[PDB]
Write a protein that binds this ligand. Structure first.
Ligand code: NA
Ligand code: NA
Ligand code: NA
Ligand code: NA
Ligand code: ZN
Ligand code: ZN
Ligand code: ZN
Ligand code: ZN
Lengths: 385, 380, 379, 385
C-alpha cells in the first residue's frame, strides 16, 4: 500500500558478479526487498526507475563475520541498539550489508546485556546485524592476544544453559578446542549455534576432535593459534587447513603476510572467508580506544596495545577485497565470493543472502575497479555513498 | 622515443588481469608495468577512467570493411582504409584476405602486399589467400569456374613470394594438398577450408603440416554420423588452431559452446568481415557476385552467406554474453591465440614488457575507446 | 553370511583404494577396512592384485548368449541374458524390447513383472526402444510398426510404469506430447531414432526427457554451423546419454569429443544382441535378418542391427582406443548409468550399505567373477 | 668390453606409467640402453624375447636425491667406489635406479676424498650414482640436527674454488640461507651445481633472497627448517612453499605428519619430490650403525642417536610410494612422478632419465599393487628381484 515496499527499479550498465557468473549486458530488477529479475538491459520496462552504474560492478552485499566495532564505537564498550545501528551505517560506506556484532571475553553480566540488545535490535532490523558472535571467553590464556587473562574461563552449567536458551540471537561462539567448554560443542551445534575454533593452543589431534564434535569455523586463521611448528606438530592451524571447515582470515597485510594468505587460499579454496575483525578505528579517525579496559592505540592502520599485541584491525571489507586482488592475486570474482557467498554459507544464511539470484534478498553493493563503494541496497533500499 | 603511460585501467595481459597498475609506453614498445602510484611525474598519462586495456586484436580473415573489398580494389589504399576502419573496433593487425579468382589478381595482390610492407609494420601483416585450391562442393560464394588445382608454375610463384604470404586456405582433397610440406617449409601457414574431405583425408593434411582451419563449420564436411566425422571432426579431434565466426549467424552459439569446450586455447575468433563491417550499406560485389546486406547478414541470391558484417569488439561481446566465455579468455581468442597461430606472438598479441605497444582500450558495454599502434595512441 | 575380498585395487567410483579389504554381509557392502584388520577366521576371496568395482549396469541390451528378448518373450530369456552378462562383469541390465506390435509389448510387461517377483537387482525393468520413433531414423526398426501412441496405449504404459524403466522415443513424434505424463509416472524418457531439429529436441528435454539412446546412431547430426539436430541438442544439454564403444557404431574420435563435452553424463551401453557371448552366424530381429561376421551385426543393406560387444570389452576399448582413464571409464559403466535411471542409492558404486553387486577384473580386461546380491561366483 | 652385448627385447603384459599417460595393452621395446618403442602388445616383433610382467606395473626408475647410505654402509664412513656400488645394488631392490650419494657435514679432507671417489666412479658407471650431494657443512647451528656443531662453518675462498672447479661431479649442495656461504650461490649455480636450502633457521626474507640468487631446491621440507610460526613469521618453510622451487620431502610418516604432506602437495603440485634421506638401515637388518662418530639406532622405523635426535630415515622409494598412495592420498600415477619425473627435472637430467619416452635411457622399475618391486632395468639391463 502507497508503495511502502517501493517502486520496482533496475540497476543498468553494470557488470554483475552473481557468485556463479559474471554478467555483461544485464540489468537487475528489485521488487520490494527481493531480487526480482535478471534480464537483458534492453528488455527493462521503460517505466522502471533506473540506477545507471556507469560500467562499474554490482555484487551481493558483503557479510562480515567478525566485527568488534567501527565508526568510532566498540560494541564491548557500549552495549546498545544504538551502537549496532552505528556499526551498520558505517559498514555501508565499505560495502558491508550484514555483520555479526562481535563481543569479546568479559564478565557474564555484559554477555547477558549483549543478548538483550541483540534481541531488541532484531525486533527492528532484518538482514543487517544478524546475530551475536561471542569471541571468548572460553579460550586459552596461552593464546589470549589482547583478551584479558582474568576473564578467560571454562563455562558453568548455568551459563551453558543461558547460551543454549538464547541461540536464536547467537550466530557464533569462538572457543578453544582444549577448553573444557568444548565438551558442549554438540549441544551448541544442536541449538543452531556455529562453533568456531580460536584463541587455542591445542594440538592437531585435539583441534580435530573439536571439529569432529561439530566445530565448523576457525576464527582469524594464524592469529592466536598454535601454528604448524614442525613436520610433526601441526597445531590448530594445521588442523584447520587439513579439514573441510570454513575459516576466516584478515587481509590487512598486518595480521597475516600476504604470502600466507596465498598458501591458505590454495589449500582452502572455497572455504576461505574474509573477515575484517575491525575496531572503532575502521571508518573513523581516532588515536586510541578502549577494549575491555585495555587501551588500544591506532597508528599507521595498526591497532596494538602497549606491549605491541594487535587488538583487532582498522580495515574494511572493500579494502580487504582490494588487498586480496592486488597483493594476494586472487581473481576479483573469487575474492567477492570470499566476502559474500562463502561467509553466507559458513553461517547458513545463504538461502536468502550472499549471492545475486532471483528470489533472494536485495542486499547489494556497487563498486569501482579502484575499489570505491558507490552505494548499497539493504532489503532493496538503495543508498548512494 | 616518446614515453607516456596509461592509468586507471583494468589491464588484461593474456596471463593476468591487473588492478592498480599502469602501462608505460616507450616509442613502439611496452616499457613497464608499474603500480599506478609509481608512474614518474614527468610522464603524461592517458586516463582510461576505469575501463579495460588489452593487446590489440588480430583478425586472421578479413575480406574488406569500411565499404571496401580487397578483391574489388587491389591497392595499398584499400589496405590503409581497412586498417583505419579496424582501429574503430579495436583491431590493430589483420591479414588482408584475397579469395578465389584468376592468377593475375593473385600476382597483383602480392605486389600490393609488398608495396604496403615497404611502409607499414605490425598492421596488415601479410596475405591470406583463401582459395582458389578448394572444392566445388564446399565453394560457398566462391566462383566455381575459378576453383582449380595448382600448376607447378603457380606453386613456385607462391613459395617464391612467401615473404608476404602469411596463410593459404586450401581443401584437403584438392590435389594441391600434395604441396602442403613445400608451403610450410617456406613459412606459409596452411589452413583447411572449403573442403568436403573425409576425416582421414583431412587428418592426412594436418599430418603433412596444415596448422589452421578456416571458419569452422562453414564450408566444411560436418560430423554427419557416428562413422563419418568429415573435416569438422578432423579439426576438432586434432591439436590445430581453428578460426570461428561469432556473429550468431554463421555458427549457432550452442555450436560455439561445444567447440570451445573441445578446443580450449586453440579456438581463435575471426570476423571474416566484408565491406558491410564498419559501414552502413545494403549490398556489395564479391568477385562479380552481388552480396546483399540485411540485419547484419551478408548473403547472395541463394541465401548463401558471403562473409560477415561483424567486428572483433562485437565478436567479443557475443562470445561473452551469448556463448558464456569469460572476458579474459575471450580476449585471448582475439589477440594472444591468433598471434600464436601465425607465429607473431614474440612481438604481438599480449601485454608484456618488450613487446610492441599494439593496444586496445574498451568499455564494459564493448565500445572501443581508442588504440595504440606501434605506441601511437588514437582515441576513437 | 560374511566374507571379505582381499588383495585387490578397489575402484569405489569416488576413490581408487590400495591395501583395503571389502567385507560383504548378506547382500550388502558391510565395511571397507585395511587388509591387516580383517579377522583371521573371516573367509577371504584373494583377487591376486586385480581390480574390484561395482557391477556394470547395461542400459540397452536386446539379447545375448544366443537369445533375443523380442524373439523369445519369457522369464527364461531374462535368466539367460542375466547369467550371460555375468561373464563380462554386468550384474544389472534393462531388457530392451524394440519396435513391434502392441500385443508383444503387453507380453513383455507380464514377463518383466513375473521376473521381478523372483529376482532383485538383476534385470531391473523394461527398456521400450520404439515404436514411437521416426521413419527417417528407423535403422533396422520396421517402418510398418513405427507409429504414434493411442490414448489406450498411453494408459497401459503409465499403468505399468512399475516395471517400465525407460522409453526411447523420437522428439518429433506426436507421442512426445506425453513426456510429462510418462515422467510423472516414474518412466525415464530417452530421445532416440529421431530426425528432429535442435529446437524440437530441446523442447522434449525441457518437457522431461533425461537420456539419449546410443548417441550419433539413428539421430539427426550436427550437419552444419546452423543445424545442430538431435546430436547437438543432447551435447549442448545436461542430460545423460548412452554411447556404444565397439569401434563400429561410433568412431573412437567421436567418443573422444563426446567425452570432452559430456564428462560425467556419458554412459556406456552395449546395445548388444544374441551374438554377444555366443557363436552364431545370423539371427532374425523383428523380421529383419541380421548377419554376424566377426563382431559386426548388419542386415542385407549393411545397416547395423545392434552390437556383439560386452561391457568389459567396451571398458577395454574406452581405455585403450578412446584414451579415457580406467577409473573414469568404470564410472561410465556402473555409477553414471545407475544415476541416469535413479537406482544409484542401492547400486552402481562401492559404498557401505549399498547392494554387493560387484565385478572383479584383470588389467587385460578379463572378468574373474561377480557378486550379485553378495553371492560370489567365479568366471 | 666382455660384458653382455646390448640387445633388443620387450616388456609385455604391464600397465605402463609413462609420467604423461597410463598405458594399457602396450609393450615396451628396449634397444641397447634406450627405450626403443611403445607399441600395442600384439605388434611386438615376434623374434624378440619378452619379459611378461603378468599384469603388474612398469614405470621409469626412481631417482633418490638424498641418500646417506643403505644396505649396511654409509658413504660418510666408507668413502669408496665400492660403497657407491653397494648402495646402487641395494637401491635396485626397492626400485631406485639413480641416486645422489649424500655426504654430510665433515672436514674438508673427507669432502675432497668424496670428489675423488665420485669422479672415479663416474668413469665406470653411467646413469646410476649421478653425482655428489654435499649436505652441509655450510649450515646453521640452530638447525644442525645430527650434524656436528664443531664442523658447521662458512666457506673459505679456497674451498669455494675447489667445489666450483669440481662441479662436474657435484650435483647439489645444501646450505643455510643465513650462512655467509650463501653469498656464493650465483657462483655455484653458474658452474652447474644445484643449490638447495636446508638446516636453516633463516627468516622468510633471507630465504627468498637465496632463492632469488639461484637456490632451486629445498632439503627435506619441515625438517631442520624454521617453520611458519605465525601469520607474520613464515621462515624457510614458508619461503619454500610460497615459491616455485622444487623441494624434497620424506614420506615415512615419522619425519613429517602425513597431513603436512597433504598440505604441501596441494601447495606445491608438480614441484614436490619424494626423497628417502635413508641410511645403512635401509635394505638391511641392523639395529645400529655409525654416522660421523655417533652411533645411530634403528628402532620402530626410526633412526636416532643416543640422545634421541633423528639421524636419517629407514625407508625406501617403493615404501614411500606406498605411504604416499595409502596414507597421504596421492593418486598412484602422480606419486610415481614424485619419485622419477619430478626429481629428474629438479636436477636437470630429465632429457635422458625419469620418464618412459622413446629415446630416453631404459632405467625402469616393475612393481606390484602391494608395492613390491619385481625388478629393474639399468641402461637396458634387466635384473629381477
Ligand atoms: Na543462531
Ligand atoms: Na610468410
Ligand atoms: Na519405472
Ligand atoms: Na654438476
Ligand atoms: Zn580474536
Ligand atoms: Zn570462406
Ligand atoms: Zn536403436
Ligand atoms: Zn639433513
Amino acid at each position: 500500500l502507497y508503495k511502502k515496499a517501493g517502486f520496482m527499479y533496475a540497476f543498468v550498465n553494470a557488470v554483475i558478479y552473481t557468485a556463479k557468473d559474471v554478467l555483461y549486458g544485464k540489468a537487475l530488477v528489485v521488487d520490494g526487498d527481493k531480487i526480482s529479475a535478471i534480464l537483458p538491459v534492453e528488455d527493462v520496462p521503460e517505466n522502471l526507475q533506473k540506477i545507471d552504474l556507469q560500467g562499474n560492478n554490482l555484487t551481493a552485499g558483503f557479510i562480515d563475520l567478525q566485527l568488534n566495532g567501527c565508526g568510532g564505537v566498540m560494541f564491548n564498550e557500549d552495549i546498545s541498539v544504538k551502537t549496532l545501528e552505528i556499526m551498520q551505517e558505517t559498514n555501508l560506506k565499505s560495502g558491508t550489508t550484514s555483520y555479526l556484532p562481535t563481543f569479546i571475553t568479559s564478565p557474564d553480566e555484559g554477555m547477558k546485556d549483549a543478548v538483550k540488545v541483540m534481541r531488541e535490535y532484531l525486533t527492528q532490523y532484518k538482514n543487517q546485524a544478524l546475530g551475536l558472535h561471542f569471541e571468548g571467553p572460553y579460550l586459552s590464556v596461552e593464546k589470549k592476544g589482547v583478551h584479558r587473562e582474568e576473564y578467560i574461563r571454562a563455562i558453568s552449567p548455568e551459563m551453558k544453559t543461558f547460551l543454549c536458551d538464547n541461540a536464536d540471537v547467537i550466530t557464533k561462539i569462538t572457543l578453544a578446542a582444549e577448553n573444557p567448554t568444548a565438551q558442549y560443542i554438540p549441544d551448541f551445534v544442536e541449538k543452531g549455534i556455529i562453533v568456531s575454533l580460536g584463541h587455542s593452543n591445542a594440538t592437531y589431534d585435539v583441534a580435530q576432535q573439536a571439529i569432529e564434535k561439530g566445530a565448523s569455523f576457525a576464527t582469524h586463521l594464524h592469529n592466536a593459534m598454535s601454528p604448524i611448528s614442525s613436520g610433526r606438530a601441526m597445531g590448530v592451524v594445521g588442523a584447520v587447513l587439513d579439514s573441510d571447515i570454513y575459516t576466516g582470515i584478515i587481509v590487512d597485510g598486518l595480521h597475516v603476510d600476504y604470502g600466507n594468505i596465498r598458501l591458505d587460499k590454495k589449500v582452502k579454496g572455497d572455504k576461505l572467508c574474509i573477515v575484517t575483525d575491525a575496531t572503532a578505528a575502521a571508518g573513523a579517525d581516532i588515536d586510541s580506544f578502549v577494549f575491555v579496559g585495555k587501551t588500544v592505540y591506532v597508528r599507521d592502520g595498526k591497532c596494538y596495545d602497549s606491549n605491541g599485541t594487535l587488538g583487532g584491525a582498522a580495515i574494511t571489507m572493500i579494502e580487504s577485497v582490494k588487498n586480496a586482488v592486488q597483493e594476494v592475486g586472487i581473481p576479483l570474482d573469487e575474492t567477492l565470493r570470499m566476502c559474500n557467498y562463502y561467509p553466507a554459507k559458513a553461517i547458513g544464511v545463504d538461502h536468502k543472502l550472499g549471492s545475486i539470484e532471483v528470489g533472494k534478498i536485495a542486499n547489494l553493493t556497487a563498486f569501482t575497479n579502484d575499489f570505491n563503494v558507490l552505494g548499497t541496497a539493504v532489503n532493496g533500499e538503495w543508498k548512494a555513498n
